[PDB]
Amino acid sequence: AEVTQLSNGIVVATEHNPSAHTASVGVVFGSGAANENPYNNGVSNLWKNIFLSKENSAVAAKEGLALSSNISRDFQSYIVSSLPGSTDKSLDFLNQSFIQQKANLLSSSNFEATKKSVLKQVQDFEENDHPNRVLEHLHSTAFQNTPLSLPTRGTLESLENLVVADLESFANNHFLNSNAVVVGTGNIKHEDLVNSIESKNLSLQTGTKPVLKKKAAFLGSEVRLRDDTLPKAWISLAVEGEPVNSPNYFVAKLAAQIFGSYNAFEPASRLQGIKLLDNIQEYQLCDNFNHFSLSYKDSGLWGFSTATRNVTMIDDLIHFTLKQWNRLTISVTDTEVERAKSLLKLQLGQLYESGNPVNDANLLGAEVLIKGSKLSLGEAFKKIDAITVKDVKAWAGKRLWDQDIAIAGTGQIEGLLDYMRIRSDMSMMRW
Amino acid sequence: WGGFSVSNPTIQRFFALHYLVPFIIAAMVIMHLMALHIHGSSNPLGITGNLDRIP
Ligand code: HEM
Ligand SMILES: CCCCCCCCCCCCCCC(=O)OCCCOP(=O)(O)OC[C@@H](O)COP(=O)(O)OCCCOC(C)=O
């Protein structure tokens, strides 16, 4: 259980697992939706779908190869999967169809067919997926006029004016050897992957990606998208949090785990050791909530999201939740900290030790692109067990107590009160 | 008057009533507020205010 990195001008990372039955090989780039502008937003989402189109997936299926891809704000992925004794064929396909030749993929017929499907994907998302479009709107009001505001799928208006030239320009600027990591997970040995690469030569482009003029900045604000015909209210609320490669990275994750997640219709979720639940269940002000701590290269967010059918008691839900947050500065106990320690270990122990090599490749490539190295799971546990009550109170006194907030909501949100009555609940007065 | 002109009985009864009526005005001010709570307040435009409210 250890990763091995080498460099030849090309970075090559690998987590070998001898007891698996598959192998994944791919390339991860260090540019995401936070590396484009409002005019070409969605060009990366359209690159993913050109990779996964028919005539490229057909050519892989005849050889016994499956394909995958993912767009995020800091990185992109293009992965190939196979049986363990078929990994050299995986690398060849990744060489031919992607890095060297792509005139086959950017044809006039394949481009229009791909654009039609992607527009239908995005239009469907904006009309039916309410919890996820409110979290995207939160990012856009918190980081307005800054690169961390742009949605990852793109916007239906900017996505309509794209041509092949926009794709080719974006490729020449960001798909570069200086901005790339080659990964390998599952039943694959490091030496074999290194040997297969030097037998070929395998370089995409040289480097010099553009530098981004503006840095990300948090701004307290709100955006309300009112729709009285929907049957619920969906709300998300956050403060500024921690970026990746921060000293307070695990302390913010432990603090989110203290308040946790809830489903009203599951019996065992009603019995969790969370003091907020003693307040909501007597009048049943929500159906579910979840606390998050999101982290990027430049900034982060810390907060919660909720959905509810009780549209006359929204003000009681927001009030009781924000008063529990205040206790992290004043009166958090030792039992609440020892519970969140061991449940945080179970959480990220399941994220980093699933059975899917595709998830391993995305995690590994994103971490090595920032830190140059991966922190093992035995090391992360020791940092978590060394946190005390004093560290939590010091973090909360700086990040939560009387600080500005960002809010987004949709649906039946008449009962959501104004900004300054919610902002005033971030301090107590009775300390 | 209490007599045949404005005199002593007039001035002593006018002071006892003058202390009383302020407490009757206060009871009418409570009934006045109850009638406002039903429909709330109007606004300078003369149209409905149920679409945009502030606490
Ligand atoms: C001791 C005397 C009074 C007190 C304490 C009082 C109190 C109030 C208060 C607090 C309001 C709330 C809205 C506003 O300020 O406009 C109000 C509204 C109102 N008052 Fe009075 N009031 C008094 C006398 C009167 C009188 C003498 C009249 C008329 C002859 C009157 C007619 C009204 C009306 C029509 C409104 C509603 C106005 C609107 O909503 O557009 N009140 N009153
Ligand atoms: C048919 C047979 C009949 C024979 C018997 C004869 C008896 C006849 C008289 C019966 C007695 C009257 C009935 C009792 C009654 O209406 O009041 C007693 C109940 C309590 O009064 P309340 O109206 O709830 O308080 C009044 C409240 O409901 C209203 O509150 P509000 O004052 O509008 O708020 C303003 C406060 C704002 O706060 C501040 C000032 O900052």
C-alpha A354/C-alpha A422 separation (Å) is: 40
Q: Same domain for A186 and A216?
A: no
Residues A356, A358, A364: CA angle, nearest 5 degrees: 110
Dihedral (Cα; B41, B45, B49, B51), 10-degree rounding:
-170
A413 vs chain B: nearest CA distance in angstroms? 12
Q: How far is B37 from chain A (nearest CA, A)?
A: 19
The last residue of a domain, from among A170, A202, A234: A202
CATH of the domain at A105: 3.30.830.10
Looking at the fold, whether A166 and A36 belong to one and the same domain comes out as: yes
Same domain, A222 and A196: no
Question: Could you say which of A166, A187, A202 is where a domain stops?
Answer: A202
Domain of A153 in residue numbering reads as 1-202
A196 and A230 belong to one structural domain: no
CA distance B54 to B39: 15
Q: Is B39 annotated as a binding residue?
A: no
Structure-token pair, residue A115:
């654009």
- Pick from A188, A276, A286, A155: which is nearest to A233 by CA? A286
Q: Which of A202, A232, A261 is the last residue of a domain?
A: A202
CA of B50 to the centre of ligand 1 (A): 21
Long-range contacts of A338-345 (CB under 8 A, 24+ apart): A339/A258, A339/A273, A340/A254, A340/A255, A340/A257, A340/A258, A341/A254, A341/A384, A341/A385, A341/A387, A343/A257, A343/A260, A344/A250, A344/A253, A344/A254, A344/A257, A344/A384, A345/A381, A345/A384
The domain tally of chain A equals 2
The verdict on A194 and A257 lying in the same domain is: no
CA pair distance A168, A186, nearest whole angstrom = 33
Residues A227 and A197 in one domain: no
Experimental technique behind these coordinates:
cryo-EM
Same domain for A213 and A323: yes
- Resolution stated for this PDB structure, in Å: 2.4
Question: Contact at 8 Å (CB) between A308 and A314?
Answer: yes
CB–CB contacts below 8 A, A to B: 4
Cα B10 to Cα B2, B7, B15, B22, B23: the distances in Å are 6, 5, 9, 19, 21
User: Which residue of chain A is at minimal alpha-carbon distance from B54?
Assistant: A418
The answer on A72 and A3 residing in a single domain is yes
The number of angstroms, rounded, from the C-alpha of A385 to the middle of its chain's C-alpha atoms is: 25
Decide the pairing of beta strands A23-29 and A233-240: unpaired
